[PDB]
Amino acid sequence: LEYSELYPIQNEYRMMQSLDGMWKFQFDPEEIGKKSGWENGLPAPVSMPVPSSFADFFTDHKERDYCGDFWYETEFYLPAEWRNKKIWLRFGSITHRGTVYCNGMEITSHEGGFLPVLADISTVAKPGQVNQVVVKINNELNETSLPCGATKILNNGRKLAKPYFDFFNYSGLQRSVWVIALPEESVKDYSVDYELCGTDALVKYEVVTTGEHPVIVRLLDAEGELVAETEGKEGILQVANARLWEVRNAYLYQIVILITDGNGVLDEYREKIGIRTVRIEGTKILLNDRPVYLKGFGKHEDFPILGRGFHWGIVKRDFECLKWTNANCFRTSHYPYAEEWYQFADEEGFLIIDEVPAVGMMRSTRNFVAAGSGNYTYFFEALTVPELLKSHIADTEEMITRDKNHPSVIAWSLFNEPETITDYAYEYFKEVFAAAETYDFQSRPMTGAFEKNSKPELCKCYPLCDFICLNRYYGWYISGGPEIEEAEELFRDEMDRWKAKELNVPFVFTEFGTDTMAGLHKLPSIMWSEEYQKEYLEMNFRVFDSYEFVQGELAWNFADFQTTEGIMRVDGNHKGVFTRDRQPKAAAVVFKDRWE
Amino acid sequence: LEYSELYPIQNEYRMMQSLDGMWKFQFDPEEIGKKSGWENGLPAPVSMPVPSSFADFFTDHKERDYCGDFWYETEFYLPAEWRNKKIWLRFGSITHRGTVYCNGMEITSHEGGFLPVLADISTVAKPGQVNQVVVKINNELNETSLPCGATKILNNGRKLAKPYFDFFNYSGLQRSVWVIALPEESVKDYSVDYELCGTDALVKYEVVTTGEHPVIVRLLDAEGELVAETEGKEGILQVANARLWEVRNAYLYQIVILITDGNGVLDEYREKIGIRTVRIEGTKILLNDRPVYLKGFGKHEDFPILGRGFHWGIVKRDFECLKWTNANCFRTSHYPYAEEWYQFADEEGFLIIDEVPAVGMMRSTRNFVAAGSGNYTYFFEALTVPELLKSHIADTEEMITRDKNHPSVIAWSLFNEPETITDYAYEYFKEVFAAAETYDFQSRPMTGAFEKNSKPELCKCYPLCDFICLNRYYGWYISGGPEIEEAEELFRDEMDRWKAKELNVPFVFTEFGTDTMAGLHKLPSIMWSEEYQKEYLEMNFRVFDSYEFVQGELAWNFADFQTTEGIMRVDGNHKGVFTRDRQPKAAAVVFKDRWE
């Protein structure tokens, strides 16, 4: 990467100033902004909170559902004392793609809506003056970038996003924005990897800087005491009597990376890390050499009004709920979350399966969204797939570079419900997995979540995985309700087929659930009732517990969340175990009791 | 009584024809019906279902809330073959009071809205012709009849019922209406009482007829086989190897009462009865000589649209729900129910505490409903109480005469939450209890439900009871929510005071509960949430289980039910364990599991 993914810090060498607040915002349905000079200021803006998704503020459909180009603008005073620094705009994300301007000048563009965008404004920044940032953003969906979908043009020319995925197309500036100042020679990246040696541990590391001066690396314990120190851009820190980062029992050291010229220090980067190992051994997931059974949820970045907008309050409530259920794990379904989620998981000892936004790659869904009105003959995969692969690999590189040093991150999920039953899909995913392994200094477990279409007899992609994640809805989409006994039979039949393959890898259920409307009670239960959610879960548990190789269960979903409206979604997806405002349905206690 | 309470049957001697259906109905706000000849036909009626409460059909407030005089009318063809019979109109009830006319002639009047009204139309009936019935009904509330309340006159002259009780003032013809034909000499009443003699049983009986001819009494088993036979209006039936009626395990014999003149039979009455004994022994409630712990609910006659209207479907669903909770008992809070409820309890082996409508006799409530707008000085108890007592005793006599022969009925509840802390209240209730014992051939246990105001140090009436029923809301009305630990302390303090009295009688909690809005979930719980209902119940159980003498628990209420609207009632009373359409809230399983 031609920029650093490192989270920004404030110290003697590095400065940061938040640009969060009310920005100026303007929709550009006619796509006239750039030729009209909007990069120098929006002509008729409204106010827009940052961070937030824009959609749910408005009271009219066309603004909520807006699809196309739209622009953000703000101004900030740059301290004069930042003069002799490399000055960057850092967006937590720009959803889905955008071009950043500063003081009227084009700085950078980015594709991918869920990872940081770094824009080097050093050459146009005006220290000791007010500066301007303008961002052109686009939220259309296509088949050459993630997540996948289509864009429909309505009779009036109005665009409408048509996802191939089951979540609302929230977009905008959904995460915090900073302007930061770095030393001219700085720490750009580092990687740690761990080895356990009895009571001791080794922290292997690499550091990438933007210069040639010597590097010193120190490790401090949770009290700030020096426990190890070495020199060089590559090395090993030896930690006596190491306090390991444990599941639901975190311990964090602080790594301190210094660039020196002998006379003094040029840069200092510090970050909390946790000494822990993760590996797959047969059907076991080993954390610090001991098996762990994953218990938790797929989540979303989703909350009323804010949409995917980041807020520490959502983090705090969600973790309190997670702990109350006795969970130990979540998957970042279906995109990398704001960095703060991982920082907090590190502190709380939660395990994370970190997922790239490779969702929407199922052919039947694509075809369905094309058949709506209307198309049944024209598709061009041969042309788009190579471009999609490039985008997928780029997002993977960005995710892993951003997240690798979190002790919480124990696995990469490289897809959710793609086509996997052709040799072509194998060749596609082989490249993604190869890239992931190359970018991950730890070479930690890699996986993806498979839809039921990936039958054990047909799937060509599970051998790429270190463990296999299954999304299954036996008792919801398949043989629901009065047919639930048949659902259980079908589920056991499938798992018997997996069993007979004797793959000797762990299986984790990454999704299972039922839409459940809080307050819908029925005796006997019906699909959509709270009681049916409980019974469905009990049936699933009986199945899970029948197979030795099943080593985790992440329910879909932690909480009800927003989707595109339609005949199958009653104000979003109601498969939450909690409501959207984070309160438990009856099924939450079922998990609490089982996971205790 | 100058009529029979016996449920109507169809045989060679007795005939019955249902008058249920759409009747004619007219409100009489100006109170002009009788002087205008409405007893000969209503001049501008609308259609009204019978059985039903009238209120919830209408779409306008004034009709729903109507209070005052209103009239019903129907016509029926009387079979010519009924010529030589005593012909009666039998109303399951007329709520609250009314006068029955037939063919333009005044037949009878009745005060009390929850027990049968019998009108002898023999002298005006026209066999082989169409006949007419017209009923003038009034639904006002006062302090000289049950249940108690007031009637407010609004500025326009419009009346409004102001109950002193927490249920909606439903009224009309809420139960089935029959026209029946009896022999000129008939069985008017009978009573059975049981004694257990090892494997055998004795059925002591009395029969009252309207003549002097000899009586023969037979007992048939459940297969119709004769197991005992004797002669005389008083006698004992000896039953070898008797199959006792047991809790949740009913067995019903059929008693057959014949009047003969030697040549032939003049009348035959048959009814199912169950051989069982009930007595209080120290702190134990003994059913067939074995202790039973009561588990169940207070109910209501309440269902959407029908109001208190009787329907066997409500009975069937409610009993299935009761059985699913593992209940064995209900109280007919706060009025005798339709007879069919008891017939079904007999079949299902449920225990019933049968309650007369002596509810609304708390002074604070009376004063409150008077202070509303407006009165704080004028009350006239010295004058009304003697009339109230007469009404209360009459209703008690009617209830016991109607219900005594149901094996399900194991106790009479003679009040719900009256004043009990004065010697005057003692003298009042002494008369009611004396009357009850006189009317009950079995002299079975007598009780009433006490409000918290009846402190152990102050109450003068509990010594009248064979067992004591307490309604308590520690954790709802007293120290709810964040104060629930204090509520438990206060509850234990009160029960410690009862304990120290060493009364050596059983205590049954006849009410405890929390308003709970289906679908309101919160973590941590709040008052009104489903989770709080569960926690409140668990706290109550801990208290109940701390006292040896507590021998039953009937939760308030089986199901959400209609009340007068107001700032404390969110579409009725939500203390149901089930919703009004009979579906379980989370707390229902708490009962199911405990009562199993």
Ligand SMILES: O=C(O)[C@H]1CNC[C@@H](O)[C@@H]1O
């Ligand atoms: O249909 C569902 O509820 C889920 C199916 N698997 C993918 C999820 O994004 C989706 O939300």
Ligand SMILES: O=C(O)[C@H]1CNC[C@@H](O)[C@@H]1O
């Ligand atoms: O307040 C309540 O919920 C109850 C209190 N005891 C009497 C009931 O009729 C009433 O419904």
